[PDB]
Amino acid sequence: IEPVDIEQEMQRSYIDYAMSVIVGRALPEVRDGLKPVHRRVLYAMFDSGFRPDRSHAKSARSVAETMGNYHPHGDASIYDSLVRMAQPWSLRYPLVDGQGNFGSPGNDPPAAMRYTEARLTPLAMEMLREIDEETVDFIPNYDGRVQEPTVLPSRFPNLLANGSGGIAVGMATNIPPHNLRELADAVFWALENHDADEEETLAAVMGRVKGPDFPTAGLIVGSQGTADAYKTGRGSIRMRGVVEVEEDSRGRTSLVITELPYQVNHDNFITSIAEQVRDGKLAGISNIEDQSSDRVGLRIVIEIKRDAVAKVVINNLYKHTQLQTSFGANMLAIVDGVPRTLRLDQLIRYYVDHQLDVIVRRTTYRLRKANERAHILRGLVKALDALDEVIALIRASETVDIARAGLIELLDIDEIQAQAILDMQLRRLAALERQRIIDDLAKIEAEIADLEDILAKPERQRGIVRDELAEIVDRHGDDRRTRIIAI
Amino acid sequence: IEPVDIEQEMQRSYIDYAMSVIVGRALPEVRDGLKPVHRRVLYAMFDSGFRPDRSHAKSARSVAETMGNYHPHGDASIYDSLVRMAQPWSLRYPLVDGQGNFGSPGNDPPAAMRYTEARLTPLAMEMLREIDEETVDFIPNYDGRVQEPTVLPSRFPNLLANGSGGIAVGMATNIPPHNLRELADAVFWALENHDADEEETLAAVMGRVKGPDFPTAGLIVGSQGTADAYKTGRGSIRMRGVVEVEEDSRGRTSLVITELPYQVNHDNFITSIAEQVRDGKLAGISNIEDQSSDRVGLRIVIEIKRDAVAKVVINNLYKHTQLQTSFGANMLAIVDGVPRTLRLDQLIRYYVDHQLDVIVRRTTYRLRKANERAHILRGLVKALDALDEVIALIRASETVDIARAGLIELLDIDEIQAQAILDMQLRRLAALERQRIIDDLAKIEAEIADLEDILAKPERQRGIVRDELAEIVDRHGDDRRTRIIAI
Amino acid sequence: ALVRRKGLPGKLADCRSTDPRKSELYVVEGDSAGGSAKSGRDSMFQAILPLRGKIINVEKARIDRVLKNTEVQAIITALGTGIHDEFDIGKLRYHKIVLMADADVDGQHISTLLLTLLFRFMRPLIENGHVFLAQPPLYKLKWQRSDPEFAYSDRERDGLLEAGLKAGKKINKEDGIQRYKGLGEMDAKELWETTMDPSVRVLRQVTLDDAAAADELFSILMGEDVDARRSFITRNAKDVRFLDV
Amino acid sequence: NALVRRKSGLPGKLADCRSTDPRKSELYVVEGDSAGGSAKSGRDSMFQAILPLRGKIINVEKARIDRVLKNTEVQAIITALGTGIHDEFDIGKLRYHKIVLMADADVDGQHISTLLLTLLFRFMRPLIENGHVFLAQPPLYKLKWQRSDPEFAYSDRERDGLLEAGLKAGKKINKEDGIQRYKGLGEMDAKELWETTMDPSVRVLRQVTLDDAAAADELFSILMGEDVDARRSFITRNAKDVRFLDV
DNA sequence: TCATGAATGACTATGCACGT
DNA sequence: TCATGAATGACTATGCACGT
Ligand SMILES: C[C@H]1COc2c(N3CCN(C)CC3)c(F)cc3c(=O)c(C(=O)O)cn1c23
Ligand SMILES: C[C@H]1COc2c(N3CCN(C)CC3)c(F)cc3c(=O)c(C(=O)O)cn1c23
Ligand SMILES: [Mg+2]
Ligand SMILES: [Mg+2]
Ligand SMILES: [Mg+2]
Ligand SMILES: [Mg+2]
Q: Mutate which of C44, C142, C187, C196 to test chain A, going by most A C-beta atoms within 10 A? A: C187
Which residues neighbour B52 within 8 Å (Cβ) at sequence distance 6 or greater? B97, B119, B120, B121, B122, B125
Q: What is the DSSP letter of C192?
A: I
Nucleotides of E under 7 A from a protein CB: 1, 3-11, 13-20
DSSP codes, B288-301:
EEE--BTTTB--EE
C4 Cβ within 7 A of any nucleic strand F atom: no
The number of folded domains in chain B is 1
Chain A CB within 8 Å of residue D242 CB: yes
Q: Which residues contact C207 (CB under 8 A, 6 or more apart)?
A: B3, B4, B5, B6, C126, C129
Among the atoms of ligand 1, which is closest to the Cα of residue C30?
A: 1
CA B80, CA B88: separation in Å to the nearest integer? 15
- Residue at minimum CA to C1' distance from nucleotide E19: A328
The upper half-sphere exposure of residue A169, i.e. CA atoms within 13 Å in the direction of its Cβ, equals 24
Please give the Cα distance from B128 to B155 (Å, whole number): 8
C118: nearest CA in chain B? B6
Give counts: helices (H), strands (E), chain D. 9, 8
Give the single-character DSSP code of D130: T
Q: Distance, CA C104 to ligand 6 centroid (Å)? A: 39
Which residues contact residue B456 at a Cβ distance below 8 angstroms, ignoring those fewer than 6 apart? none
Find the Å distance, CA of residue D175 to C1' of nucleotide F7: 32
Parallel, antiparallel, or unpaired: how do β-strands D98-102 and B234-240 relate?
unpaired
CB atoms near residue A444 (< 10 Å): 20
Active site residue C29: yes
**Long-range CB contacts (within 8 A, 24+) of D68-77:** D74/D119, D75/D11, D76/D11, D76/D13, D76/D14, D76/D51, D77/D29, D77/D51, D77/D53, D77/D116, D77/D119
Q: Is residue D106 a known part of a binding site?
A: yes
Report CA(C71)–ligand 1 centroid distance (Å).
12
Ligand 6 centroid – CA B114 distance (Å)? 11
Count of residues in chain B: 487
Do the beta carbons of residue C98 and residue C45 sit within 8 Å?
Answer: no
Beta-bridge mates of residue C203: C134
Q: Which helix (H) or strand (E) holds C151?
A: strand C149-151
Q: In angstroms, rounded to a whole number, what is the distance separating the alpha carbons of residues B342 and B350?
A: 10
Cβ–Cβ < 8 Å for D122, D61 = yes
Give the 3-state secondary structure of chain A: CEEEEHHHHHHHHHHHHHHHHHHHHHCCECCCCCCHHHHHHHHHHHHCCCCCCCCCEEHHHHHHHHHHHCCCCCHHHHHHHHHHCCCCCCCCCCCEEEECCCCCCCCCCCCCHHHCEEEECHHHHHHCCCHHHCCCCEEECCCCCCEEECCCCCCCCHHHHHCEEEECCCCEEEECCECHHHHHHHHHHHHHCCCCCHHHHHHHHHHHCCCECCCCCCEEECCHHHHHHHHHCEEEEEEECEEEEEECCCCCEEEEEEECCCCCCHHHHHHHHHHHHHCCCCCCEEEEEECCECCCECCEEEEECCCCCHHHHHHHHHHHCCCEEEEEEECEEEECCEEEECCHHHHHHHHHHHHHHHHHHHHHHHHHHHHHHHHHHHHHHHHHHCHHHHHHHHHCCCCHHHHHHHHHHHHCCCHHHHHHHHCCEHHHHCHHHHHHHHHHHHHHHHHHHHHHHHHHCHHHHHHHHHHHHHHHHHHHCCCCCCEEECC
Could you check: is the Cβ of residue C71 within 7 Å of any atom of nucleic acid strand E? no
Query: D54: Cβ under 7 Å from strand F?
Result: yes
Region of residue B284 (left: phi > 0; alpha: psi -120 to 50; beta: else): left
| C-alpha D56 to ligand 2 mean position (Å) | 9
Bridge partners for A172 per DSSP: A167
Burial class (CB in 10 A: 0-12, 13-18, 19+), B474: exposed
Q: What is the resolution of this structure in A?
A: 2.5
Measured between CA atoms, the residue of chain D closest to residue B278 is D8
Residues B114, A67 contacting (CB under 8 angstroms): yes
CA-nearest residue for atom 5, ligand 2, is D55
| Sequence-separated (6 or more) residues with CB below 8 Å from residue A49 | none
Strand E, CB < 7 A, residues 63-82 of D: 63, 67, 70-72
Cα D2 to chain centroid, rounded: 25
**Marked catalytic residue, from A70, A93, A115, A365:** A115
- Ligand 2 atom closest to Cα of residue A74: 22
Between CA C46 and CA C3 the distance in angstroms is 14
D88 carries a ligand binding annotation: no
Pairing of strands B57-58, B117-120: antiparallel
Q: What is the number of residues in chain C? A: 245
C1-245 CATH choice from 3.40.50.300, 3.40.50.670, 2.40.50.1020, 3.10.620.30: 3.40.50.670
Q: Which amino acid is at C199?
A: S
Domain ranges of chain D: 1-247
**Residue D224: its chain A contacts at CB < 8 A?**
14
Sign of the CA dihedral A182, A188, A192, A196? positive
Query: Is residue D108 among the annotated active site residues?
Result: yes
Q: Specify whether the CB–CB gap between A98 and A86 falls below 8 A.
A: yes
Cα separation of A200 and A345, whole Å?
Answer: 9
- In a 3-state reduction of DSSP, which class is residue B11? helix
Q: Cβ of residue D117 near strand E, that is under 7 Å?
A: no
Contact predicate D74/D68, CB 8 Å: yes
C233 touches chain B (CB under 8 A): yes
> How many beta-carbon pairs below 8 A join chains B and D?
64
Crossing angle of helices A400-411 and A415-422, rounded to 10° = 120
With CA atoms as reference, report the closest residue to B70 among B2, B134, B142: B142
Instruction: Collect all residues of chain B within an 8 Å Cβ-Cβ radius of residue D18.
Output: 289
- The whole-number Å distance from B29's CA to F19's C1' is 24
Could you tell me if D184 lies within 8 Å of chain B, comparing CB atoms? yes
Contacts of residue D4, Cβ cutoff 8 Å, sequence gap at least 6: D20
The reply to whether the CB atom of residue C22 sits less than 7 A from any atom in nucleic acid chain F is no
Residue C196 near residue C157, CB atoms below 8 Å? no
Q: Are B484 and B220 in contact (CB under 8 A)?
A: yes
Pairwise CA distance, residues C209 & B5, whole Å:
7
Pocket residues for ligand 2 (CB within 6 Å)? A 74, 76-77; D 54-55, 72
Q: How far apart are CA D138 and CA D152, in angstroms?
A: 10
C175 is in an annotated binding site: no
What does the angle CA A227 – CA A233 – CA A238 come to, to the nearest 5 degrees? 50
Chain A neighbors (3+ CB pairs < 8 Å): B, C, D
Of D53, D54, D73, the one to substitute when testing ligand 2's pocket (max ligand atoms within 8 A of C-beta) is D54
Task: Please state, in angstroms and rounded to a whole number, the distance separating the CA atoms of residues A54 and A117.
Answer: 12
What is the SS3 assignment for C50?
A: strand
CA of C53 to the centre of ligand 1 (A): 6
Is C31 within 8 Å of A54 when comparing Cβ atoms? no
Beta carbon of C53 within 6 Å of any ligand 1 atom: yes
Closest atom of ligand 1 to B74 CA is: 22
Q: How far apart are CA A210 and CA A207, in angstroms?
A: 6
Return the ligand 1 atom nearest residue C70 CA.
Answer: 11
Experiment used for this model: X-ray
Task: Tell if C32 CB is < 7 Å from nucleic strand E.
Answer: yes
Proximity of residue A27 CB to strand E below 7 A:
no
Residue nearest to nucleotide E13 (CA to C1'): D55
- How big is chain D by its Cα radius of gyration, in Å? 20
D1-247: CATH number:
3.40.50.670
In a mutational test of the D interface, the residue from A14, A143, A173, A338 whose CB has the highest number of chain D CBs within 10 Å is A14
Test the D interface: residue of B113, B114, B115, B293 with most D CBs within 10 Å: B115
Which helix (H) or strand (E) segment is B127 a member of?
A: helix B122-127
Instruction: Check D186 against B54: CB less than 8 A apart.
Output: no
